[PDB]
Amino acid sequence: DCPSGWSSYEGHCYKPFNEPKNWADAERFCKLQPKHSHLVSFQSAEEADFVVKLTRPRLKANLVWMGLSNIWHGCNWQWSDGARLNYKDWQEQSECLAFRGVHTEWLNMDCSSTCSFVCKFKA
Amino acid sequence: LEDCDFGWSPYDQHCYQAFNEQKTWDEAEKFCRAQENGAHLASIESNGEADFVSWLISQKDELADEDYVWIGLRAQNKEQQCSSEWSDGSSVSYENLLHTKKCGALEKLTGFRKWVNYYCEQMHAFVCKLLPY
Amino acid sequence: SPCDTNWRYYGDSCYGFFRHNLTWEESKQYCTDMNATLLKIDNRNIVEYIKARTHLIRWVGLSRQKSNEVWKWEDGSVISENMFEFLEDGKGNMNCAYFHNGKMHPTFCENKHYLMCERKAG
Fold this sequence. Notes:
- Chain C: This is C-type lectin domain family 1 member B.
- Chain C: Residues 1-122 are extracellular.
- Chain C: Residues 10-118 form the C-type lectin domain.
- The complex is a heterotrimer.
- Chain A is an alpha+beta fold.
- Chain A has a single domain, classed as Mannose-Binding Protein A, Chain A (Roll), CATH 3.10.100.
- Chain A has 2 helices and 8 strands.
- In chain A, strands 1, 2, 3, 4, 6, 7 and 8 form a 7-stranded mixed beta sheet that branches.
- By secondary structure, chain B is of the alpha+beta class.
- In chain B, 17% of the residues lie in helices and 28% in strands.
- Chain B contains 2 helices and 7 strands, in the order E-E-H-E-H-E-E-E-E.
- In chain B, strands 1, 2, 3, 4, 5, 6 and 7 form a 7-stranded mixed beta sheet that branches.
- In chain B, a hairpin with a 4-residue loop joins strand 1 (9-10) and strand 2.
- Helices cover 16% and strands 32% of the residues of chain C.
- Chain C is built from 2 helices and 7 strands.
- Strand 5 (77-79) of chain A pairs antiparallel with strand 4 of chain B.
């Protein structure tokens, strides 16, 4: 099924970890798991409902990393007048996505903050 | 230049005006269009213009204790957020968003120069840009 | 210094820029209504000042009293030889000139453009 500690849903194995890491450290932690894994992704409402069902005993309420980083990077940015975005003057900040251990809603956070996370792999 | 309308300030081939009225980004764009010829929320295409727009705003005293000032930057977009794949490499299908930061603004704390993505439905002062005519 | 509201001082002259869309002759009339003259441009130096000041098409005081004759300023003087470099192509029946972005262009006198006037600083 799934090794010890891991839960099964829809052909995949999931594990929460309640120990605060930044987004980048979290992703690599998952990577370096005995079964190589990634930050949990959501492909459906039902899967999100299942993962918060998992989180709730374990991780309540901590903010929990999901697998989305640099969420405001590759937007198709354009001037309203239709002039070229040639000169560029951005800030200096990277946002990543998380949810509370208790609800399905997502929250944009500075990637360098520290919370908890869930790993996921295909079985 | 000088061939600007009253209320408008020249700089380099364009006329500019900061309006202290607080509008959502969209309301600001529409307001600018309606100060026709073809006026739009400002585009910043250079260091000199950034410096100019920044000086224009600082100069407006009614502006005001104001955190943000809309400019004409908006993402196109199209999804609810811009990261097109999860870290596992799969594409972003289901999305669960919530206010989103898909419009660009200048910020008080950053000297009205550096650009900040910010929530489009937030009401703020804005700068329009126009081609003399 | 010696100039008034809406008139800019340069050299020994006061210059006024007016966004009234008028024919060449109507513009001439507008200027003398203010005891002024449509602009004379007889050197490169004034070229650069004017193009600094505006980038919109504006009539200047250069015209040829009949088609295919010599180009003359308001004061009746003929455009200096050095200034031909700044006078662009035209047709024989284009008798009046406007200034735009550092060049003078011959065009139909009955067309409408913005204008500028000049007075001696006093």
